[PDB]
Ligand binder design. Structure first.
Ligand SMILES: COc1ccc(Cl)cc1C(=O)NCCc1ccc(S(=O)(=O)NC(=O)NC2CCCCC2)cc1
Length: 488
């Protein structure tokens, strides 16, 4: 009867209208801190530095472009001396700093892979410790860490220090993402649980505009990192004024704290007359009513569903986080491609929302996934001579994958049974990050062929699109109460 208590104190009042906004505001930096290795680690055109013994010193080939490997040993030797990087559009990047060109090309992918590896451990550890210390405490620690370990990376004199600090920043950021929604959805009524779920998505989708503006505003990478990591201190200074969730207090066993929090929120809302009526006995009379992860194993009915759901999550995450990177090579500047990519998610979600309930849950998923897969696989045959279809197909694929993410979230939310839903959603989201981890890993094979990663990126969604035909349709049906009655 917690919902009735919320409607008694006022339900959706000023307390919510302040706290939800002030808790969702810092999510505008997710897009900036996630896809930063497009502006902070761009590769400009470079060539071998001739010896200081002096135009014709390099074996230029492929339409006269200077060659970056050899240096005409005699007026066929490795450089081992240095490179002359261009400074017309990219004054300084990571490759310009430690010379990760033509011999250590895979280290950019390695850094991205480590940054993504530092997301799984966060989502695990700080999700475990969120239900044992308190949402607000963990949020405060996350706010402190994202600024402490994020601003000192801009002064790293070596590569491993930068990698480790980025890993820790991702560790904090993974926890902030989960805890934000976990604390936000608790204070809202049951009838407004889906409205806030879509709110976070559009907040995330707006951060690409800020990234595009800021990157142009400051070209330097150290200053860019400092600026994108600084505001977390301001967000942290105020973060002591939040109110702990009442549901967690009630479930823990301490009802006095729940009572006090209810009175306090009543004072903020201005309904103290009902708070005074609220007492200990009525709470014990109204809330008197108030699953292992291995149960998925040794029970085929849930294992069969979980396997397919995890496969879909993995395929979607792999395709999405392989697509969004490597903006270079499209002919158009990365700055413009950023805003173009950020301008296609809104219509993707808008169209997908209608089609989940109009066409069907599974029809929409299969159509979107197949279209994205074929569109991406098509990109690997047309030559780079073109400059229009290359961008059109990429943006269409990105939007389609965003719509696929919007559809699968609701599909898994409404598919699983009631009691095991909380752990099933977490397990499904867990497999949505291994694909992101492995995305930079398979891009390292670009040395073998110049489009093999692109072919790999299109085969997985195409294969997964035919896998959705093995799940029941559940449109316009009651939520399955339990496993016993779960038959159709
Ligand atoms: C992965 O569960 C979601 C899927 C879609 C949306 Cl709307 C929200 C969530 C969500 O709240 N999960 C819990 C916490 C969370 C949030 C974001 C991320 S994320 O990985 O950094 N974001 C994305 O992948 N895509 C975004 C959203 C969809 C359009 C394109 C941009 C990872 C975890």
């Amino acid at each position: 009867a917690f919902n009735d208590l919320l409607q008694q104190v006022g339900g959706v009042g000023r307390f919510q209208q302040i706290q939800v906004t002030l808790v969702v505001l810092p999510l505008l930096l997710m897009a900036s801190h996630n896809t930063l290795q497009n502006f902070t680690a761009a590769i400009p055109t470079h060539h071998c530095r001739p010896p200081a013994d002096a135009e014709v010193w390099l074996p230029r080939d492929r339409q006269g472009q200077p060659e970056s490997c050899l240096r005409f040993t005699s007026p066929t030797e490795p450089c081992t001396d240095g490179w002359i990087y261009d400074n017309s559009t990219f004054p300084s990047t990571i490759v310009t700093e430690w010379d990760l060109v033509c011999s250590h090309r895979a280290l950019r992918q390695l850094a991205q892979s480590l940054y993504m590896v530092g997301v799984l451990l966060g989502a695990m550890v700080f999700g475990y410790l969120a239900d044992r210390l308190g949402r607000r405490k963990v949020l405060i620690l996350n706010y402190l860490q994202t600024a402490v370990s994020g601003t000192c990376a801009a002064f790293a004199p070596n590569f491993p220090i930068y990698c480790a600090f980025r890993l820790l920043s991702g560790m904090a950021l993974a926890g902030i993402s989960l805890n934000c929604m976990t604390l936000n959805v608790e204070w809202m009524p049951i009838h407004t649980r889906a409205c806030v779920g879509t709110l976070i998505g559009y907040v995330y989708s707006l951060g690409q505009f800020l990234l595009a503006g800021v990157a142009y505003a400051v070209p330097h990478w150290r200053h860019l990192q400092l600026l994108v990591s600084a505001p977390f201190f301001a967000f942290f200074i105020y973060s002591w004024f939040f109110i702990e969730s009442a549901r967690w207090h009630s479930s823990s066993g301490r009802l006095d704290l729940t009572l006090r929090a209810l009175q306090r929120v009543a004072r903020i809302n201005g309904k103290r007359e009902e708070g005074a009526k609220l007492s200990m006995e009525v709470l014990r009379a109204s809330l008197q009513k108030e699953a292992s992860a291995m149960e998925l194993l040794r029970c085929p009915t849930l294992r069969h569903l979980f396997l397919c759901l995890s496969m879909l999550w993995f395929a979607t995450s792999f395709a999405y986080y392989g697509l969004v990177m490597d903006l270079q090579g499209f002919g158009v500047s990365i700055y413009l491609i950023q805003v173009i990519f950020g301008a296609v998610d809104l219509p993707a979600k808008l169209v997908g929302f209608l089609v989940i309930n109009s066409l069907g849950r599974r029809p929409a998923q299969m159509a979107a996934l197949l279209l994205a897969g074929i569109c991406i696989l098509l990109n690997g045959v047309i030559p780079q001579d073109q400059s229009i279809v290359r961008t059109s197909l990429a943006v269409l694929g990105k939007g389609c994958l965003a719509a696929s993410f919007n559809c699968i979230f609701l599909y898994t939310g409404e598919l699983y049974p009631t009691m095991i839903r909380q752990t099933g959603m977490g397990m499904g989201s867990t497999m949505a990050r291994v694909g992101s981890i492995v995305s930079p890993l398979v891009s390292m094979t670009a040395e073998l062929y110049p489009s093999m990663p692109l072919f790999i990126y299109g085969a997985v969604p195409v294969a997964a699109s035919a896998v959705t035909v093995l799940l029941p349709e559940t449109l316009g049906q009651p939520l399955p109460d339990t496993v016993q009655d779960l038959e159709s």
